[PDB]
Structure formats: structure tokens, C-alpha cells
Amino acid sequence: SGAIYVGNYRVVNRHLATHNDWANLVWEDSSRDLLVSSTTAQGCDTIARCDCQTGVYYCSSRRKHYPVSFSKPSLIFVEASEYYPARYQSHLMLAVGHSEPGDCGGILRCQHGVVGIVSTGGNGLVGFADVRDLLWLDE
Ligand SMILES: Cc1cc(C)c(CC(=O)N2CCC[C@H](C(N)=O)C2)c(=O)[nH]1
Ligand SMILES: [Zn+2]
């Protein structure tokens, strides 16, 4: 689990959105596994606006932050799960790192701010849904 809190927005994995998120919906995109809802309180996270390919992510299954190198946002095939059929997920970045089901929502960050959130995983792989192109999160 986990979210980005920037301005009056809450960014979560679409597959983990709650009823309150859907009832306060700003934007959602199943192809990216992202959903943004509105908040009453202002958040403290800032979004990175860069082309970094190195950063650090939070892994809840190890209670640890790990440095990673990650690929550029791309269209990647993701296997069928209990949340989506087998499909191509867009704006996804892959890295070598530990992940398990339940780690979705952990933040990936660089020196410029938040880059994205954990959205997929494999044997020694972790995938992140990029948010750097969502300029509207800044206003
Ligand atoms: C090792 C490991 C295995 C699995 C299965 C996962 C979870 C996962 O990738 N998905 C399930 C939740 C919807 C995700 C999506 N964006 O389509 C796809 C994980 O994080 N780590
Ligand atoms: Zn950066």
C-alpha cells in the first residue's frame, strides 16, 4: 500500500483505490495503474520533473529503502493477476530489486522529488508507474 500526497491530490495505484477515492475522483487510467483523488489537507510531497534513471524506492516487505537503476517509461507486458487481465501497461519503468504483492504504492524518488510508485513485481524485479509527465499535479 502507499500514496503520493502533492498539493490537494492523493496518487494511488488504481487497483488499490478505496470507495472514498472513487467518490472524490480527479483522474484515473487503467493502462497506467494510476488513480488521483482530491484531499482536504495539503500534502508535502513534490513531484520530480527530470529524466533521472537512478533513485531510491521504499519496499514495505523489507521495511527498507533501496537504491535502484530503472528503465525509461515504456509499454510493458504484465501477466494476468487478480486485478487486471494480461495486458500492456504504459509509462512503466523496471528495475532489479525486491518486491512482493503488497509492496504496491511504495515511493520511488530521485534528487528532484517523487518519480513514481511501485506498481508491478517479478523474481528480483520491481516496476514503477511514472508520474513525472503529469504536470497538472503541480497546480
Ligand atoms: C514478486 C511480485 C509478484 C507480483 C504478482 C506482484 C504484483 C503485481 O505485479 N501485480 C498485481 C497487482 C497489479 C499489478 C499491475 N500493475 O498490473 C500486477 C509484485 O508486486 N511482486
Ligand atoms: Zn530526478
Which residue ranges make up each domain of the chain? 3-44, 45-139
Contact 98 CB / ligand 1 (< 6 Å): no
Distance CA 60, CA 15 (A): 17
C-alpha 123 to ligand 1 mean position (Å): 11
Three-class SS of 65-128:
EEEEEECCCEEEEECCCCCCCCEEEEEEEEEECCCCCCCCCCEEEECCEEEEEEEEEECCEEEE
Distance, in Å, from the CA atom of 87 to the CA atom of 3, rounded to the nearest integer, reads 24
Kindly report the CA angle at 91 between 29 and 110, in degrees rounded to 5? 115
- CA dist., res. 121 & res. 37, Å (int): 25
Q: What is the CA radius of gyration of the chain?
A: 14
* Among candidate residues 61, 28, 7, 42, the one with its CA nearest the CA of residue 129: 28
Any ligand 1 atom below 6 A from CB of 102: no
What are the cell numbers at 76? 510493458
Residue 22 backbone dihedrals phi, psi, to 5 degrees? -65, -35
- Greatest CA separation found in the chain? 39
| Among 30, 40, 33, residue whose Cα is nearest residue 2 | 33
Q: Is 5 exposed, middle or buried (0-12, 13-18, 19+ CB in 10 A)?
A: middle
97 close to ligand 1 (CB < 6 Angstrom) = no
Report the half-sphere exposure of 66 (CA within 13 A, side-chain side).
19
Q: 36 CA distance to ligand 2 centroid (A)? A: 22
Catalytic residue among 21, 33, 103, 130: 33
